[PDB]
Amino acid sequence: CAVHALFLILHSGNILDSDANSKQADVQTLSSAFEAVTRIHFPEALGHVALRLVPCPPICAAAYALVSNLSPYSHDGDSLSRSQDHIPLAALPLLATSSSRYQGAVATVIARTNQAYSAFLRSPEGAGFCGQVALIGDGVGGILGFDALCHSARLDFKVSGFFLFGSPLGLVLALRKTVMPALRPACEQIYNLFHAADPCASRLEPLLAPKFQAIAPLTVPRYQKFPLGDGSSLLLADTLQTHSSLEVVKILERWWGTKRIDYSLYCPEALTAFPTVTLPHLFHASYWESADVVAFILRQVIE
Amino acid sequence: ACAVHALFLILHSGNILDSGPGDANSKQADVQTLSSAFEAVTRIHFPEALGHVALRLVPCPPICAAAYALVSNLSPYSHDGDSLSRSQDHIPLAALPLLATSSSRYQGAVATVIARTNQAYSAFLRSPEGAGFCGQVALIGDGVGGILGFDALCHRLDFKVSGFFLFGSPLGLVLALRKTVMPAAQMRPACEQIYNLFHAADPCASRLEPLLAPKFQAIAPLTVPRYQKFPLGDGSSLLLADTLQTHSSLFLSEVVKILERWWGTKRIDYSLYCPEALTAFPTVTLPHLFHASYWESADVVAFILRQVI
Structure with missing residues (x-):
């Protein structure tokens, strides 16, 4: 009697932005990408996914x-x-x-x-809708989303999985950890997605377990060769056991979900050499039309 | 009685890029470079004050290492x-x-x-x-050292500081954060003057003046003259009043308010000459270049000496 998966997109925009319809341009790009990929590789789900804009403030404007x-x-x-x-x-x-x-x-x-x-x-x-709900935030929107998910008994709904697009959240948290050194997202899983060449890219995992500094982020496969995944596992337990050299159960409880959190998207190395002022736009826009990302998300929803 | 008339204490935290513990015999190399530059300039353009200036290391912590x-x-x-x-x-x-x-x-x-x-x-x-020394004392801080020095001055030091020179310090960013955490000024440093010296192409370079009077945004930092072309300065004024009079267009009494709020009688933001090519350098290579450049910069030494004499 309705669609099965709702994505609420928290869109603060490019971090250098100092427009609401445009945000819908982004969302409509993303939805068009969704159905473009869905038709080809996920036909069971065609028209079974919905995306809705949530315009969030440009909190970095004053800064x-x-x-x-x-x-x-x-x-x-x-x-x-x-x-x-x-x-x-x-x-x-x-x-x-x-x-x-x-x-x-x-x-x-x-x-x-x-x-x-x-x-x-x-x-x-959305009449008669009973499906899972997911949050997607862009670089800035993601921070707001996370902080919204931590707050005490006010989201009307239970969030299933949260996706961050090139978000410097890890830096923010670091600051907090420094200000109040002594120290739980209301979601079943957090996906920190980033391009390594993005200056706003920050890992989250070493903040939960410092030894994860020594473990590479999981790779997001390229859509051209592995549209349905490369058969590698995303589960934290399997990563913990490959890196058996440390106990371990002491990490499963704190973790934000059962899967890994840091995900590395493919990116040319050239982008590291770009003028600073030009990078936030490129990365911010890239997510809305990235086949790797939409395929990744689609692989997380079909389970 | 004693020959030194001015003592410079150099707060040396080191290049912001070394997480490693500060070698205190590599800092003295820097200080000795600075002193050699001092005597090189003095011997030609400030002979009256030959042997009347002393430079001493104050080894400061690399506070950014953990970060x-x-x-x-x-x-x-x-x-x-x-x-x-x-x-x-x-x-x-x-x-x-x-x-x-x-x-x-x-x-x-x-x-x-x-x-x-x-x-x-x-x-x-x-x-x-320094036996029998009663003269003026000044502080010089490198990029990080400058932040520590500032915070030390803002409300313990055994002596009174006439002058305070910062070499490419990101202090301005820190204050911005503070001004952000609490918008409740009190951060007035206990010195007779602050000199924020920077190369524009330095990624740590940040102005202080717009924090004291915001539309000093629209007023360029004072230029530090090149020693090769103007060994004795270019005769332009460093006093705040002359800038307030030159720009008066922007103020209407908000002019009297800035004079008392202000840290000293002179301006604070000073722009050292720098090739624009350096802006295109990889960031990882710049803290070294800029930190190193101060200890042998004639622009800097001539500027400082003109402020002491």
């Missing part, structure tokens, strides 16, 4: 402005000229999530997630 | 141990001072710096060269 004002070329008006300057990308999520206005942003996000969720149910397509 | 390690472990290439291999990935230089000064143990480091600054100051006094 970007401040940091721009502190630049040695702040007085200079030529945008061409400022295209060369070192943008402190890493500082932006720290400043943004250290703002007193941040909690407000999280509350706001929870509110509009609830609104979109209660807009889908009362829609014709 | 560097942490952020490296969070790298998508964390499993790779090879430094050559991990010498091309993205170093989040900006995050390092924020994480370092957000530690619940930094204050300890600030305290450490004060203990060793006092110890150096009281090592100079009981030294033959």
